[PDB]
Design a binder for this molecule. Structure first.
Ligand SMILES: OC[C@H]1O[C@H](O[C@H]2O[C@H](CO)[C@@H](O)[C@H](O)[C@H]2O)[C@H](O)[C@@H](O)[C@@H]1O
Ligand SMILES: OC[C@H]1O[C@H](O[C@H]2O[C@H](CO)[C@@H](O)[C@H](O)[C@H]2O)[C@H](O)[C@@H](O)[C@@H]1O
Length: 262
């Protein structure tokens, strides 16, 4: 599977930008674009040899871990650190079989009894996303935390917190130029801060936005989607147009209707 590298060591807006751009480049194929927004490969009919991509993360502490991302949703399904690999609890038998194709040479394979969704991870971390700082510092720390898990150096709450950090700074950033921008800003000013409502609501609405855009009538949503601004106030989305600078890719929801141009 394709590998994209990134290190928090001496990270800059440009190096992070290159990283996210490369990740998106391995996620979408260009075969499916709707209203100018790329769609991820459809799970249905997708060959296993094209199912995952790997993100090799390194940090200033000279530690490295490899995250595995599912190309169908850009989400993290597991990771490898040294001679051990850990996978989030699969949703079904097909996915359980699919992950056996990852880190096949690792000496110790483990599947967590818990899933990688935020609800579950927040419960295990003992903190909500709104209370977990993001930025290059948090990522640097998260990489070390993931690395030290197999030896008992990392407690479960810290592990979960670290997953929450990685997922948002990699998966959500790949999904939304807006979130990529949020991380770029944190890097530019070496600031670590929790995601505000605009970030949280986008993360929570990615699936719905993907469906709304794909089911839209020439871009017009059948029903509006409510997002939130930085101050928590409502922002109504009625059309795909307002999302062009915001969402970078979508999960496949339905087949694109015929061109049907006038
Ligand atoms: O801000 C750019 C640097 O970010 C990381 O380092 C910072 O994060 C560390 C862990 O929290 C802090 O100890 C340090 O004080 C922060 O500046 C990265 O590890 C550095 O290599 C980057 O230059
Ligand atoms: O059309 C080619 C094959 O598609 C199936 O297999 C792919 O899609 C599945 C999910 O729908 C994956 O689980 C599988 O690994 C992929 O190869 C279909 O089941 C096969 O009969 C078709 O030949």
């Amino acid at each position: 599977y394709p590998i994209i590298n990134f290190t928090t060591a001496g990270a800059t807006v440009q190096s992070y930008t290159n990283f996210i751009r490369a990740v998106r480049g391995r996620l979408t194929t260009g075969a499916d674009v709707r209203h100018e927004i790329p769609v991820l490969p459809n799970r249905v009919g997708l060959p296993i040899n094209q199912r995952f991509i790997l993100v090799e993360l390194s940090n200033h502490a000279e530690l490295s871990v490899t995250l595995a991302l599912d190309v169908t949703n850009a989400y993290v399904v597991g990771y490898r650190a040294g001679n051990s690999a850990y996978f989030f609890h699969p949703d079904n038998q097909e996915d359980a079989e699919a992950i056996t194709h990852l880190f096949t040479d690792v000496q110790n394979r483990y599947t967590f009894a818990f899933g990688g969704n935020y609800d579950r991870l927040e419960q295990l971390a003992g903190n909500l996303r709104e209370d977990i700082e993001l930025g290059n510092g948090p990522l640097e720390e998260a990489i070390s935390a993931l690395y030290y898990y197999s030896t008992g150096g990392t407690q479960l709450p810290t592990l979960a917190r670290s997953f929450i950090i990685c997922i948002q700074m990699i998966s959500e950033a790949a999904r939304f130029q807006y979130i990529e921008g949020e991380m770029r800003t944190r890097i530019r000013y070496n600031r670590r801060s929790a995601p505000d409502p605009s970030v949280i609501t986008l993360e929570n609405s990615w699936g719905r936005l993907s469906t709304a855009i794909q089911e839209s009538n020439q871009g017009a949503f059948a029903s509006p989607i409510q997002l939130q601004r930085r101050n928590g106030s409502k922002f109504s989305v009625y059309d795909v147009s307002i999302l062009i600078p915001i969402i970078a890719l979508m999960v496949y929801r339905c087949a694109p209707p015929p061109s049907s141009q006038f």
